[PDB]
Design a protein around this ligand. Structure first.
Ligand SMILES: CCCCCCCCCCCC(=O)O
Ligand SMILES: CCCCCCCCCCCC(=O)O
Lengths: 277, 238, 252, 61, 158, 277, 238, 61
């Protein structure tokens, strides 16, 4: 089905046919194959590009964020999580998405929440299972300012209640973008006067995500770390582009430091001698 | 209810699974689909596009256009190797970063032929013949033109047709090779020599640039999904 | 002979006797917005020949040490005849564009340029800790140029060529609609870009749909007494130009 | 039910290889990935020329 | 009447009317900021335009890697007599040169040059009967507005 | 199916047709569209009002109550929960329901019960999983006066037994109202002499809900917090009305404080200048 | 029993899920259905109903009927802007609380046209012509009638027909816009001017009230369910 | 069984999109929400007039 091209058996040649000669100036990539520049044998190639599919390539859960929130109200520790959803803080997944200019797809979101008890001299407890609450707040919705804010009522905002021990919570979401496709790159501004925000943040706005412990309080300080995972499915991509070369500096723009095109070597004719009997 | 028995692997979370799951946004009206130009279906569509290869990747040119320059001069240079490199589409520093190699680094296995297109950028008056050879693994790198000539070679004659393709056939023992090529999955080497020489008229440069392009053929394919070793971080970006 | 070609749009016509075919965007050709893809309910205006014609920008000089140049559209055409007038009076716009880069020398000169059209060519800043200014991204028909070395400007674009000011490899820009101008075979380069964006239409001042970059991979060279002045002129013509949201002209 | 039988990917014992599927949720976004869509058209990027170029012929003439 | 340095907008009235509500009519942009000259170009440099080039605007300068900036690092579009003019002239980006490469005992430099700039290199060669100890070449590195060779030259053992 | 109206292509005009002119005095809302007051292009609108459905709008679990009950019998802490069922103590869900005068629907009730161990110097325990019991008592049924009352026998009253760690208990209920529809507003009294109770509480009576720990006792004091969630389904609504403007004061009536119609601003002609090149 | 494998997301509780569940009251005989007047099927049925808009929302009128009053006077007032505001159905303080905007605040996305109906409440002897203009995002707010007149406008002639509709067409780049509109998803502005003036006979008021109504069209629609930011509490009510 | 196949809501890969459902409980109150009932009739609130009013005509005459 997604099979690869076979190699036709070719023999000697001596004609005005010039498949090897061309002109890249046309912007046309040569469509030559081994059988065109040598004598080849017939080969029934059964190989398949099934795993090169944009679907199989991007459809794999990848971490996009991670924050920690405590249980007790001691010191200036955040007791809840806040996050302006986006996939530009994790270089791995961010680099893949940026292989294309525009994207369209549904998505499977999985959460890996783990807790712990902070070190201490006398910390003997017996706390029941910790239950967490993850609430999604689309742009404009009321934001909670405490682990007891009325906003956690989740009247209409989607929210998940998960208790430790059980399988990591998950749920799918459609294609939210108000545009016909998500934009990984936006060479424009937010204001017509050509100023303000520049790039991604200028238009993308998937809202925010908040988390917290629904448990009232813990005898001794404890903390939990939530890890968000994205897995696009039913994918569509447009306009491919040069992969990221320079390391990512900011998660709001494409700033970078002049990076080398590639690793170095002795000379253009350098090739390590691996045959030494 | 229906008597059920949970099998091992339950409640786990495999990043590469594929199950159904409840939508957090029921009856959401997705934005109408718009037909956008240049849609990609398979990554191989990208690896099949020629991209300039930095053959002259010496420390002094790692950040200049000279990295792509492959000089050729007039005068006797017989026995001199214009350039050479291993055939590691994803490991060789020369290909490692090209569109092709850049994609192979997201996979661990690869197979197929490669198209090395060479373009003469000299003047319209400069002429010459170069010998583009490819030697499969097994023996030492060609030290002389005779040794290189014994392998799969292409004699390129510079003329109106600026470019010339040197298709490196897939001559491997195994069906696939590792992108992280080792000696076992060796691919061989590619050496360029002067078939004749570069003759030029008076009042014309004596040094010319020869660009190199690399791309996959219709018989190419990757196979083992992995993370690319060309990107990382030490903390969440901000 | 496929070497010679002629282009005719509006009251303008371009001639060539040494071209190398014509690249057509991503296989697509400019077309007006269909009813099953439109959003703006108001009836659009289509000046046609009035705006869809060849506009020549300020020429540039190619020197033995030139690192490259770049233009941003449709911004670069804000002051071009009626095409620029519709940009001012309208909120939304949509166009095709036929890029035609000219550059002739002689059988005794040598060099190779890379004419490319990069959609959403978001660029980085010289000082990674600061931001860039529109003034440094695009300045009308005046071209910005790449530098063979790193830049330092406060809100300037990292003009270092090797990274094309995008943090990528220049050798991979071939993945975008492009053509080369190898003086020993060429004389110009034409690229027909179709409207590429994640939206049916968009503002033409706030958004720079695509960036035209002309980066030389083969340094310009020649002998003594050989014309040292080798200019590179860029001509572009909008295609299927549509406009929506008519209102008071925007004060630049 | 609305069962839909498809073909599985070749196994390590080739040369009953089909699976069944039923959607339980009302939203298409809930369905599993489309890992079996094998469409291709490199022409967009490899041959975006206006005039068809025949391999066995000169690019320019 | 337009102030300095502003210019009249032909499409609008520079006049105001006293409405019945004892309020002056809404003012338009009948007088806009005079635009400064195009900053120009800096050979092997860059001009940062953060907020246009009109009166009151500022622009910064920088030099590409391998070049040192000579002059002002910025310029303001101030009002100069009858118009708006850039405060400081365009600076200069002069090539950073490495110190003369080192000569080595019993060896030479192949195709020695006059100057050596960023990324340029020098390849050594030991005389007949001597053996090279170390890398053949070194490279002009240009941190930080001062040029410096990558490392030490090779050595020739007889 | 629930698609939106398309825009017919309109051209110039010059007739006695006056679609723009009307008279609101009739109480009739103008049915004009862009094509009636200007030249428009044909547009195949595929947008859908699928998420504007009263079903999709109200069918989302929203918290309606929350109380805490302890395990040990120390001090004057309640060891069990009591609650006169109603959705007027949580402004979020209450405001939505009040968008309509009458309602009819079945309902999915979910409970999120979480426990904890109160702070202390020496609180080393090893308590087994805590099991809870939620019992619904329709109007008239015997009410328990202790965590060991005979009423907890749940002879005929619906009750749920849940142990921590497992998924939050849930169960559906039909349309209980003795009327043909639930009433969010009752501009009347409970007594014919026009006195006594006024409004909602005058007729609504969904009974009470009690909770407790079935565990005998805990070594050291522990407490649990139960959160009740309502999710109406198979919805029907009648007589829409002006959304709540003034903040909710009491949960028994509609009392309020004179609130502003909306936020203020400089003047009627004030519009922020967002274009400043 | 049947070998089963639990998938991630099991035992969780998503407020927007939709599964079946056992009834706590088996065989309950639901009260007979009664056909009650004015049933609502879709919330859009409400957002399509005209509601008085508080255009004159100045601090001094935030609690009086003057908030809805849009005065117009006799005499020369050329060049004077009667009123103006942004087009933010759910964010603009002017629409923020109308039936329409009040509903949009339960959603994050919106799309469609809006019907701004203006009613002259002066005497039957008062006459006049007003210019109701709408300018799409891109340029500064119309400072003069000429600038406003260049945009989508409606010249309302007061007469027997008290009301006049100014339909604001949906002229956006994207299919949808955020209720929490930012500069990117700007909608434009609406300015009212005097086309001519308000002439009146002797013994008749010189100041008249003009009410404004706002509602959605048949092409309007919301999309992202969210909680409204116009209601909250600090503790359980009692 | 008493399976009933319906149509799913459009996905992010449009322009097998159907799901199956079976009720296991005896009470209709146990069934899932009716998120697919798209009925409309704004007339009740937008045009509750006794005499039909034609848009292109004067409200009063
Ligand atoms: C219920 C959680 C909602 C989370 C929304 C995530 C949307 C991700 C969109 C990614 C956009 C992009 O990568 O260009
Ligand atoms: C088994 C638990 C029974 C709970 C009954 C809840 C009934 C809710 C009725 C809400 C009435 C209203 O909102 O007007």
């Amino acid at each position: 089905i997604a099979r690869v091209a076979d190699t036709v058996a070719s023999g000697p040649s001596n004609s005005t046919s010039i498949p090897a000669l061309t002109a890249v100036e046309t912007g046309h990539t040569s469509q030559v194959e081994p059988s065109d520049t040598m004598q080849t044998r017939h080969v029934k190639n059964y190989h398949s590009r099934s795993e090169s599919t944009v679907e199989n390539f991007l459809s794999r859960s990848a971490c996009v964020y991670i924050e920690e929130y405590y249980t007790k109200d001691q010191d200036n520790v955040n007791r809840y999580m806040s996050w302006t959803i986006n996939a530009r803080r994790m270089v791995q997944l961010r680099r893949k998405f940026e292989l294309f200019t525009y994207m369209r797809f549904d998505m499977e979101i999985t959460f890996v929440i783990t807790s712990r008890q902070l070190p201490g001299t006398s910390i003997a407890q017996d706390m029941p299972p910790l239950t967490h609450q993850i609430m999604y707040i689309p742009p404009g919705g009321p934001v909670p300012n405490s682990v007891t804010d009325f906003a956690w009522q989740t009247s209409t905002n989607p929210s998940i209640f998960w208790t430790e021990g059980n399988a990591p919570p998950r749920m799918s979401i459609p294609f939210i973008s108000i545009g016909n496709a998500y934009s990984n790159f936006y060479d424009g501004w937010s204001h017509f006067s050509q100023n303000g925000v520049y790039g991604y943040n200028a238009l993308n706005n998937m809202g925010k995500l908040y988390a917290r412990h629904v448990n009232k309080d813990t005898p001794y300080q404890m903390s939990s770390t939530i890890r968000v995972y994205f897995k696009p499915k039913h994918i569509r991509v447009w306009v491919p582009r040069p992969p990221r070369l320079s390391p990512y500096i900011k998660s709001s723009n494409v700033n970078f430091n002049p990076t080398n095109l590639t690793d170095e070597r002795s000379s253009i004719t350098y090739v390590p001698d691996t045959i030494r009997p | 209810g229906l008597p059920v028995l949970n099998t091992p692997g339950s409640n786990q979370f495999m990043t590469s699974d594929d199950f159904q799951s409840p939508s957090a946004m029921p009856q959401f009206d997705v934005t109408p689909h718009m037909d956008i130009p240049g849609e990609v279906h398979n990554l191989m569509e990208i690896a099949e596009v020629d991209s300039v290869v930095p053959v002259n990747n010496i420390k002094a040119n790692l950040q200049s256009m000279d990295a792509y320059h492959i000089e050729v001069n007039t005068g006797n240079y017989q026995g001199e190797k214009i350039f050479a490199f291993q055939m590691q589409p994803g490991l060789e520093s020369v290909f490692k970063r090209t569109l092709m190699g850049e994609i192979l680094n997201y996979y661990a296995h690869w197979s197929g032929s490669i198209k090395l297109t060479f373009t003469f950028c000299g003047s319209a008056m400069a002429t010459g013949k170069l010998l583009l050879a490819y030697s499969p693994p097994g023996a030492d790198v060609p030290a002389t033109r005779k040794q290189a000539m014994l392998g799969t070679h292409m004699i390129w004659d510079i003329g109106l047709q600026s470019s010339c393709v040197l298709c490196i056939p897939w001559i491997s023992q195994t069906h696939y090779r590792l992108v992280q090529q080792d000696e076992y999955t060796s691919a061989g080497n590619v050496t360029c020599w002067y078939q004749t020489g570069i003759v030029v008229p008076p009042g014309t440069p004596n040094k010319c640039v020869v660009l190199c392009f690399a791309s996959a053929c219709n018989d190419f394919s990757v196979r083992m999904l992995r993370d690319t070793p060309f990107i990382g971080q030490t903390a969440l970006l901000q | 002979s496929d070497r010679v070609r002629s282009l005719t749009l509006g009251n303008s016509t371009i001639t060539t006797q040494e071209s190398a075919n014509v690249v057509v965007g991503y296989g697509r050709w400019p077309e007006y917005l269909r009813d099953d893809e439109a959003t703006a309910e108001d009836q659009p205006t289509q000046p046609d020949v009035a705006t869809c014609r060849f506009y020549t920008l300020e020429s540039v000089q190619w020197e033995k040490n030139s690192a490259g140049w770049w233009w941003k559209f449709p911004e670069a055409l804000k002051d071009m005849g009626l095409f620029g007038q519709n940009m001012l009076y309208h909120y939304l716009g949509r166009a095709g564009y036929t890029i035609h880069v000219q550059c002739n020398a002689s059988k005794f000169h040598q060099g190779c340029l890379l004419v490319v059209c990069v959609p959403e060519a978001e660029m980085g800043c010289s000082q990674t800790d600061k931001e860039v200014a529109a003034m440094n991204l695009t300045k009308g028909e005046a071209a910005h140029k790449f530098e063979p070395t790193k830049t330092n400007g406060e809100h300037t674009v990292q003009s270092i060529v090797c990274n094309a000011g995008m943090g990528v490899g220049v050798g991979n820009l071939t993945i975008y609609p492009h053509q080369w101008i190898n003086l020993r075979t060429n004389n110009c380069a034409t690229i027909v870009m179709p409207y590429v964006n994640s939206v049916p239409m968009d503002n033409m001042f706030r958004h720079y749909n695509f960036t035209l970059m002309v980066i030389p991979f083969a340094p310009l060279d020649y002998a003594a007494q050989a014309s040292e002045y080798v200019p590179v002129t860029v001509t572009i013509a909008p295609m299927c130009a549509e406009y929506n949201g008519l209102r008071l002209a925007y004060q630049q | 039910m609305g069962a839909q039988v498809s073909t599985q990917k070749t196994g390590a014992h080739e040369t009953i290889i089909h699976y069944t599927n039923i959607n339980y949720y009302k939203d298409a976004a809930s369905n599993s990935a489309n890992r079996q869509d094998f469409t291709q058209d490199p022409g967009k990027f490899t041959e975006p020329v206006k005039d068809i170029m025949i391999k066995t012929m000169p690019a320019l003439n | 009447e337009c102030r300095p340095g502003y210019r009249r907008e032909p499409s609008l009235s520079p006049k105001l009317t006293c409405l019945q509500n004892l309020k002056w009519s809404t003012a338009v942009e009948f007088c806009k900021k005079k635009s400064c000259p195009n900053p120009g170009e800096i050979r092997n440099g860059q001009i940062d335009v953060p907020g246009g080039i009109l009166f009151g605007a500022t622009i910064s300068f920088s030099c590409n890697t391998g070049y040192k900036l000579f002059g002002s690092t910025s310029s303001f579009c101030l009002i100069s007599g009858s118009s708006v003019q850039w405060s400081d002239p365009l600076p200069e980006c002069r090539e950073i040169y490495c110190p003369a490469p080192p000569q080595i005992d019993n060896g030479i430099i192949q195709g020695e040059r006059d100057h050596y700039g960023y990324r340029q290199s020098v390849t050594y060669a030991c005389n007949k009967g001597f053996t090279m100890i170390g890398e053949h070449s070194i490279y002009c590195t240009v941190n930080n507005d001062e040029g410096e060779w990558s490392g030490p030259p090779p050595e020739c053992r007889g």
